[PDB]
Structures are given as structure tokens and as C-alpha cells.
Amino acid sequence: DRINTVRGPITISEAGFTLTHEHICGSSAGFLRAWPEFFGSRKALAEKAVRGLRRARAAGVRTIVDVSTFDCGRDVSLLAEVSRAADVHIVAATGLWVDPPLSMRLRSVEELTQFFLREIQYGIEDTGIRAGIIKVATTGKATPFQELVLKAAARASLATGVPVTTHTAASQRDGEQQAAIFESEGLSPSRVCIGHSDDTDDLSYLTALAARGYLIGLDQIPYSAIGLEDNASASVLMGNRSWQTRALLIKALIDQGYMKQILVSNDWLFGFSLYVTNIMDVMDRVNPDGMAFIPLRVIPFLREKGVPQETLAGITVTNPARFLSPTLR
Template sequence: MRPHRTEQSALLPHLQTVTGPLPHHAVTGPVLAHEHLVLDLDRAGDRAAVLDAERHGPAVVTELTQLREEYGLGLVVELTCRGMGRDAPALARVSRAAGVPVVAATGWYYEPFHTPDVVGSSVEHLTGVLVREVTDGIAGTDVRPGVIGEVGSHGEQPSEPEVRVLRAAARAAVTTGLSVATHAHLGRGGAAQLDVLTREGLPPERISIGHQDLLDDPRVHRELAASGAYVAFDTVGKEGYQSDATRLRLLLALLEAGHADRALLSCDVSRHGYLRTEGGQGYGHLFTGFLPALRSAGADDDLLDLLLRRNPLRFLTGGAEPPPGPHAPLPAETTP
């Protein structure tokens, strides 16, 4: 693995969580880099793509608490943004109840979920909306976003409204010092997203391109990582979209190409059926299913700490290097 590259962007002195500022060195355990704790993406009326704060909140708290106790879970990056059923007060309640810091987000998802204020709005107006949330709080609360995301597009090229949203996200990130996490639908269009974001002056090391484990193209992953952007393998356990065996192969290819310092991992729990109480894999599948297989493939404690803690913290802060670890128990190899 090559040495970490030197990054030139301004560094944030702390993480902004739903319960207040947190020094990045205070996070001593693994980070879930892309999750949802409260969510409403229902468009079919079946209420499947929902994580309701009242109905499902207790199960979410239980899972996060167990992960903190068993694996030292140190932080959850919660990427539910505008138009996705975001609930800032509920996130603060979940964070306090589970004893796990949570970073909230602002931005707009991909076009089918855009809120009415996107229609016809200029990039300047949209930028102002995001900057005000970062500086003043979400929807009249004192909960401030600590990341911009998951800003979305679908297809190889973003639509015109998606371009405006991406440009606004980049400008808001440059203004506030936050980083940007994207939703590349089914893993496609990451290079185009990166181009739009960087053209607005946002350094690649403050960008995470989402859902790349759904794209079976190691060349694209290498090119994104070589640019300095983070490559998110963030749908671990969603076997209906991609097998974990394929995810592992793609991740190992990226690591072998020398880009271990650019990979992010998470499960992207995005419907209540994924919760363990409903028979799903839960937020912990990364620890109980995927990481043991990664360790069996040769990953040691230092590599796991890099992937799970140092990379996401470096992404969130714009490049501040966390102290070395590991500090928390990590999964052992899969028993033969």
C-alpha cells in the first residue's frame, strides 16, 4: 500500500454531529460511512422504503447500541437529505439513546426525489439553501449538517436539475468546508459527478462517489481513486443488487492497485426490511459478514482500521489524518 497522499484543502478542526461538535481524534472505533437511520423514500405506497422514527426507531437504537458494545462503533454518517424524509430531532434522539455520534446531511437526492424548491431554481439559490442549513441548522433546529449528501444523479450523465444540484453542493462545500458524498445510481455516472463537482473548485479528496460496489468495473474505481476521490463500497449486504462475493473481489482489486486510502465501507440500510428485527442483515452485516471475509483474504488490523475509521474521518474533515489504531475490537477471520 502506498503512503497516504498529501492533501491541500482546508481541514475542519472537528466533526459536526447532531449533538454538537466532536474532535475527529475522539472517534476511536469504526465508522459506518453511509447509512440511514430515519428515512422515507416511499413512492409506491407500500411503505417498504421507510425507516419511521417512531415505529422503527427502537430497533435502530438497539442495533447501533450492540455495535458500539461489540465493535466499538464510533460514528454513523447519516446521508438522508432533503426530500428523503430527513428528521433532524429524531437523529439526535437516536444518537443519544444509542451512545453513538451521528453526522447529519444536507443536499438533494437524485431527480425523482427532488423537492419542489429545485424546480427552476438557480445554482446560486440552491447554494444559499445549503449554506444556511449548515450555518443556521436544519428546519429551525440547532442540528447542523456535517456533510453534504447524498447528492444524486442517475445514468452516465446527470440530468439538468441534477447538474444544478451537484454544482450547488460543490459551491456550498467550498464555502462551508464540508465534504460531499454522492449517490451514483447503481454505481453509474461517478466520473461525470466528479467532473461537475471539481469544476466548481471542490478538491477531489473532499468527494466520495457512492455505490461503486454496484458497478463491476475496477478500471473506473481505479480512476476515481487516482484522482484523489473516495470510492464508496457502501451497499454491503444488499445481495439483491450485488453479491458480497463480487463486492469483495472489487474491493480487493482496488486495494491491490494501491488505493487502500481511498475506500469507504458501509451497508446503506434504506428500508425497514433490512433491520434485524424484520429478518434483514442490519447495520452490523459489515462487521459480521463482510469484514471476516476480508480478513480471511489477508486484511490485518491496520488495514481494517484504515478502511473503517481513518479513511472516513479523513474524508469528513477534508484531509485531517486521525491517529493510528486500531482502537476497537474488529472481526476475526471466518471460521473454516
């Protein structure tokens, strides 16, 4: 029926063209509040985000999913503010990313489940803003704590119908262990997106997941450190393949007959404190289109390579709606 946004519950039909993996600000918990000058200021960060969202909107984007968790420095009232100013829906996330603090690392699976459910059914902090997605992450084989997080995510999903989205190291085929763990919890693959899947050339790894009912997150399309290979921080972050190479996996998955299982995005941000301090400037130099990269560059590129209009709109409208709309299957 309805989807939780930072401005309240909306009908599925209001989502329209959705980017399913983005960030307003990728930071750490409390870091934006304690040190806004890292980002110019809170106001300059907010203005920059509103500019970016209005540009993506002019290009046809109606909704983004901010998959920043607690430990990724999600600041939900910032998300609320830029949503209202830009008139772009924003779905906020719960879950845990790859930098949980000690107060999280020491929690049991039952405690974590209570936490994730809190931010979905009760709200995030004291904002009354409720998460419409759960974000989790592994980086290679899951640590014992990550195993907890994945189970807690599956359980929160199973109690609410809110889907799970993942950060992976696709090159190490993380999606296979993630999926094995999600299924052990009785979670339906149709409530799970295996993200960062565009970082691999292995089309078999992808179609198998797709054939199992999972969604495939081809969500870092503009990421490439070509031309700046000596920037270590950009190189680890963006890798060494072209955006066209990343974008061509969309076509490949379509040609295998799995367009229904594809979600595309930019994984873009407007502030970034988690690498070298000017990583955001370096990324903006790589992709001046920001979040409008998908509608402005990827969509025409794919149409030029022969992909039908109906298909590109199914991937950017139908699939996100079917993914976000609350269900157990």
C-alpha cells in the same frame, strides 16, 4: 478540528470506527411526521433504530453518517434522539437526492447554494443541528436540475470544508460526469466520495477515480436479492450479485494500492417508505445484522482473504476521519 453531529461538534478523535453511508429512515420530507403509522409508530421506529445502533456499537461502530437529505425524509430530531439513546455519533446531511419537490426543482444554483450552506452553518430547520456532509445524486446522465445541485454542493463544500458524498448508477459510470462537474467548480477530489461504487465489476472505472484523489464508496455491501429474484422492488434495489462479490472490490482496490481512498458501509436503514411498503422487512430478512454487517461479516471475511488488520482499521477509522475533517484539500 471538529465535526458537526446531531448532538453537537465533536473532535475528530471521537469519531472512531465510522460507517460513512447509512440512514436512520429513508422516507420523504414530512412523511414520517404526517404518517408515522407507516413505520409502526415514531416510537417503534426509534426503538428499532436504537436497538440496531447499540448492536452495531457492540460490534465496534462509534459513528455513522446519515446521508438522508431533505427530500429523503431526514428527520434530524429523530437522529438526535436515537444518537443519545444508543451512544453512537450521527453526522447529518444536507444536499438533494433524486426526489426533490417542486419547491426545490425551481431553485437556481445560487438559491440551492444558500440552502445547503444554511443547513451547514446555521442549522437544519429550527433545531440548531448542523450538517457535516453534503449528499448529491445522479442516475445516469445528470438532468439539468442535478447539474445545478452538483455545482451548489461543490460551492457549499468550498465555503465550509464539509465534504460531498454521492449516489450513483455505477453501471453507467456516473462518477465520471460527477467528477467532471465537481472539478469545473474547482472542488478538490479529496472532498468527494463517489458512492454506490460497489455496484460495478469495472475495476478500471474505480482505480481511475481513486488515482485522481476521490474517495470510493463501497457502501452497499450487504445488498443482494439472490433467493428472492422475483421480488421486483428488492431486485431493482439490491441487484443480483452476492455480498462477497461486493466485498471483494474492497480487496481489489487495496491490492491496486488505493486503500487510502476506500470508504465502506452498509447503506442500511431502520425504516423505508420509498419502495413496496414492506421493503424494510424484506431487507431485514436478507441481512439480519443490519449496520453491524460491515464489522461482523465484511471485516472477518476480508481478514480471512489475507487483508491486514492495520489496513481494515485504516479504512474504517483513518479514512473517514480524513474525509469528514473540514478542509478544502
